[PDB]
């Protein structure tokens, strides 16, 4: 019948496809059009190691998406590369390939970077290169890339695209911005991208071993936040069959999704519009608590706009579980966590 | 470094060693120049061989050392480049794999843009594919005080200008390294030959009397 | 030019369009060539001897602006003989002589 659910309410499911049924060129992108949408940009080649693209796409397609909000996805590379993969995730609704190269100006006006909801860029061949000034440079010059791009027609300039890169050696992280006051004593939790979130490595996830131990527990929580959600049956599934399956809905299984959502909320409108001008963080936790229990915990706040003289540069900072007394100015960004579908 | 008011001072970065330090150091001061009145900066992350000393010292009052790195942001506090005028890169022609050396320049030159926006740059690339890159990082101004001089390109343009007339690659190649007219006797071609080698090319603003005038007739005058 | 230079960058290819009036006016970049000495009108002074009549009569009436010499190797020795290769002399003064056989630099003006 509907076949919509993985047998489990996990994840959504479909039938599955072959390469040419999705392989595009740059005229369908032309003809096609897309919106608010993610487009990742993968380096590499055959010879190069393989990277786990399964899990990436699997949080995107919760089964806490209504299917009139879900998010479009698309894949920029190299084709020889990705067919070594595409192996492992072909059942997913609605996703894109690109051949090409992401340092093609033009190849990426064609998947409309510029109107899209978010950005992100991995990198493969990390692991066999030796020096490590070598690596990290194909997306560093890609990342500069897309901000330099000039645009015309709403967004017209290379810095309001986000963008969300990964690298390996820490130090390199000075090369993200231009208006930075870079170091290489400071070490990584403090430096401007980082806590302006478009920045990210491997190296902090070190410390968790410590709070792994001390408490069993948390390991399963952040697992639910991050993937999802990882119940026995679904890893057990996992390893038994190597790949997914899907049986028919079950009166259980439609209600199985019913599972809070993280999201974002803005002050410029909505109901929440007439706080904006209420001062208080409190205030707005309590109101919002009893017409929805929406969870508050983050403020998420412009980079000048603290100071007096006014101007124009966009870039965002965090600030997490702020006291009851914290001055609210009219134009940012608050964490907010859903609780129906 | 320290700074001294009333002058200027440049940089240079790269490949290091001695063949490449000879000859541009032999092309920048040569006496047939304009009065010259600059200082020369080095950084390298190799401390220089006995061989080299020679050279950094023979020229005790125009050339001036100091060891560190590029990449590192004190370094380039120490050079002083916040008053400098330009940062010239060599960049090794003989390399073995051409794209880790470009790839290498390429970050250099992110770094010293990373460090200050303002700055002229002056640098070589190996392969026309790889040169444009270096026109997307966020401040080149291709229209104001900045350049970069590729070799592949010039050289295959060289050598197809070249194929319309013969020897025209030689009279190109001659403008441009700086050389003194010579006494030869004997009646041999390199008498006649090095009448014209040490001729160069210059720049000057004219004269206000000649705006009036016919390009043909004023050429003819000069 | 800076146009050419934006498009190079952007589509990673030459393309071109249905010619339009300006671009076809844009061809009056001149040009890089050689000429020959013993005939033609110029070789009414082929034993002239003095770069300085050709170079003022050239560009004069024709545009034809010259700078280099070319001149073969053996073309000064009293002995004859018969090797056929050339060398190069740059911005020769006024008063240098010039032999029956020689070819001369030059730029042409238009098309
Ligand atoms: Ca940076
Ligand atoms: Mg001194």
Redesign the interface.
């Known amino acids: 019948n509907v076949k919509k659910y993985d047998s489990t309410g996990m994840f959504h499911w479909c039938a599955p496809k072959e390469i040419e049924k999705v392989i595009l060129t740059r005229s369908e992108a032309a003809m096609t059009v897309l919106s608010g949408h993610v487009v990742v940009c993968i380096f590499g080649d055959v010879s190069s190691a393989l990277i786990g693209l399964r899990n990436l796409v699997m949080p995107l397609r919760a089964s806490n998406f209504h299917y009139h909000e879900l998010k479009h996805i698309v894949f920029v590379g190299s084709i020889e590369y990705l067919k070594r993969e595409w192996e492992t995730l072909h059942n997913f609704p609605k996703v894109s390939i690109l051949p090409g190269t992401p340092?093609?100006?033009?190849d990426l006006r064609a998947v409309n970077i510029n109107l899209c909801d978010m950005c992100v860029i991995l990198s493969a061949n990390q692991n066999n290169i030796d020096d490590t000034?070598?690596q990290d440079?194909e997306c560093?010059?890609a990342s500069?890339?897309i901000?330099?791009m000039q645009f015309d027609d709403s967004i017209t300039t290379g810095v309001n695209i986000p963008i969300i890169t990964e690298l390996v050696n820490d130090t390199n992280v000075?090369?993200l911005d231009?208006d930075?006051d870079?170091?290489?004593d400071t070490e990584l939790y403090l430096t401007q991208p980082f806590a302006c979130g478009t920045a990210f490595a491997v190296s902090v996830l070190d410390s968790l071993m410590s709070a792994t131990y001390f408490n069993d527990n948390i390991l399963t929580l952040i697992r639910t936040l991050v993937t999802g959600g990882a119940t026995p049956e679904l890893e057990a599934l996992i390893a038994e069959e190597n790949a997914l399956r899907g049986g028919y809905s079950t009166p259980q299984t439609l209600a199985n999704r019913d599972r809070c959502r993280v999201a974002q909320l803005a002050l410029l409108d909505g109901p929440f519009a007439d706080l904006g001008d209420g001062g208080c963080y409190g205030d707005l936790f309590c109101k919002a608590l009893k017409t929805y229990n929406m969870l508050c915990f983050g403020i998420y706040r412009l980079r000048d706009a603290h100071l007096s003289t006014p101007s124009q540069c966009t870039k965002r900072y965090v600030i997490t579980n702020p006291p009851y007394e914290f001055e609210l100015v009219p134009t940012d960004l608050i964490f907010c966590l859903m609780q129906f579908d | 470094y320290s700074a001294v008011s009333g002058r200027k001072h440049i940089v240079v970065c790269g490949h290091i060693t001695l063949e490449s330090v000879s000859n541009f150091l032999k092309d920048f001061l040569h006496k047939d120049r304009d009065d010259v009145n600059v200082e020369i900066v080095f950084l390298h992350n190799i401390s220089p061989n006995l061989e080299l000393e020679a050279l950094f010292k023979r020229h005790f009052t125009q050339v001036e050392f100091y060891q560190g790195s590029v990449?590192?942001?004190?370094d380039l506090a120490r050079v002083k480049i916040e008053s400098a005028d330009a940062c010239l890169i060599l960049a090794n022609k003989y390399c073995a794999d051409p794209d880790?050396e470009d790839?290498?320049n390429?970050?250099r030159v992110?770094?010293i843009?990373?460090?200050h926006?303002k700055i002229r740059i002056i640098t070589q690339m190996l392969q026309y594919h790889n040169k444009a890159?270096l026109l997307?990082?966020?401040?080149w101004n291709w229209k104001e005080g900045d350049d970069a001089i590729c070799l592949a390109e010039l050289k295959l343009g060289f050598i197809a200008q070249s194929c319309l007339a013969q020897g025209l690659s030689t009279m190109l190649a001659n403008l441009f390294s700086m050389r003194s007219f010579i006494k030869i006797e004997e009646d041999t071609w390199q008498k006649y030959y090095l009448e014209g080698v040490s001729n160069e090319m210059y720049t000057e603003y004219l004269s206000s009397a000649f705006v009036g005038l016919s390009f043909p007739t004023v050429c003819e005058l000069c």
């Open positions: 340092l093609s100006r033009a000034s070598l440079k560093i010059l500069l890339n901000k330099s000075q090369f231009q930075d870079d170091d290489p | 990449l590192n942001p004190h880790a790839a290498s390429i970050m992110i770094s843009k990373n460090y926006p890159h997307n990082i966020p401040s």
